[PDB]
Amino acid sequence: XXXXXXXXXXXXXXXXXXXXXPHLSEQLCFFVQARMEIADFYEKMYALSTQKFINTEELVSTLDTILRKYSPLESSFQLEVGVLSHLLKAQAQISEWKFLPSLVTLHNAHTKLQSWGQTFEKQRPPHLFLWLMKLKTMLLAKFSFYFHEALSRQTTASEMKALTAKANPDLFGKISSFIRKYDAANVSLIFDQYPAVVSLPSDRPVMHWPNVIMIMTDRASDLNSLEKVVHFYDDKVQSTYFLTRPEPHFTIVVIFESKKSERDSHFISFLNELSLALKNPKVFASLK
């Protein structure tokens, strides 16, 4: 880790090893051995920060293999590696729209992290731990957004507002302000078949789906680039559509029952903000 939060942690022991050279008894330590591998793991994740998406699945099984191969400085290790592991598993589940499984894994990371964040401030953070925290909130906010309907149908306003509270950014709220602000007919989150897992304000706009589906089929290429915002006006029905695909399985659509220009920048940018907040690669990028 040519960064710092992993370098300084690799600087101390670089000067702490010159100490045990005193007494002995515990020279045998696959710690720096285990350390050498996970830093190579972090270098790998930073390299994948340039890809369109990320196969977290492969990253999870690749971490639980260099981990099981090694079962204070031990408690810390277990936290980092334990949380990194949890966060990656939730990232894989959320992209497969698995509500309960992701809920459970997310809670682990969160809970283990809060517990640490507490026990830490009571004694007084390294970029790496800050990043773990940052990856956690990005994923919790994605969770809250991708499963908003279930979370709302299965909870209490109190409990929901409690969760929403921790959600930063509150993506559902943004979309809500946007719809009120510009009077869009609908904004949906589509999971790829092609149902609407989130829909505002009312339920999935039935009469508009044919247009939405047709558009996703024809612009699949532009959409699958995961970086473009497609626009389409339907004169026959006088409706405008804006779609972007933040990740492989998810598509966001904004529908206006009126002509809207493919130049109304604020609608493009709004969609660019939402997409950016849901991209896993971007967070791996701030790793350095």
Helix/strand/coil (H, E, C) string of the chain? CCCCCCCCHHHHHHHHCCCCCCCCCCCCCCHHHHHHHHHHHHHHHHHHHHCCCCCHHHHHHHHHHHHHHHCCHHHHHHHHHHHHHHHHHHHHHHCCCCHHHHHHHHHHHHHHHHHHHHHHHCCCCCHHHHHHHHHHHHHHHHHHHHCHHHHHHCCCHHHHHHHHHHCCCCHHHHHHHHHHHHCCCEEEEEECCCCEEEEECCCCCHHHHHHHHHHHHHCHHHHHCCCCEEEEEEHHHCEEEEEEEEECCEEEEEEECCCCCCCCHHHHHHHHHHHHCCCHHHHHHCCC
Strand order of the β-sheet with 229-234 is 196-200, 186-191, 250-256, 239-247, 229-234
| Resolution, expressed in angstroms to one decimal | 2.5
∠ CA 88-90-51, rounded to 5°: 50
Place of tokens 């997310």: 106
Radius of gyration in angstroms for the set of CA atoms belonging to the chain, rounded to a whole number? 22
- With CA atoms as reference, report the closest residue to 97 among 190, 1, 203: 190
Place of tokens 């990028």: 285
Give the C-alpha separation, 14 to 32, whole Å. Answer: 10
Give the C-alpha separation, 65 to 85, whole Å. Answer: 11
Q: Which residues does residue 172 pair with via DSSP β-bridges, in sequence order?
A: none
Method of structure determination: X-ray
235 class by beta-carbon count within 10 Å (0-12 exposed, 13-18 middle, 19+ buried): exposed
Q: Which domains does the chain have, with CATH numbers?
A: 1-169+279-288 (1.10.3450.30), 170-278 (3.30.450.240)
Give the C-alpha separation, 3 to 142, whole Å. Answer: 27
234 class by beta-carbon count within 10 Å (0-12 exposed, 13-18 middle, 19+ buried): middle
Q: Give me 286's structure tokens.
A: 């701030």
- With CA atoms as reference, report the closest residue to 278 among 254, 255, 244: 244
Q: Are 105 and 93 in contact (CB under 8 A)?
A: yes
Chain breaks in the chain (C to N over 2.5 A) after: 21, 71, 124, 192
Contacts 24+ apart (CB under 8 A), 107-116: 109/83, 109/136, 109/139, 110/136, 110/140, 112/79, 112/82, 112/83, 112/86, 113/83, 116/79
- With CA atoms as reference, report the closest residue to 84 among 31, 54, 39, 144: 39
Give the C-alpha separation, 56 to 88, whole Å. Answer: 6
Contacts 24+ apart (CB under 8 A), 181-185: 182/256, 182/267, 183/256, 184/254, 184/255, 184/256, 185/239, 185/255, 185/256, 185/257
- With CA atoms as reference, report the closest residue to 178 among 258, 277, 271, 243: 271
Q: Give me 204's structure tokens.
A: 């999935």
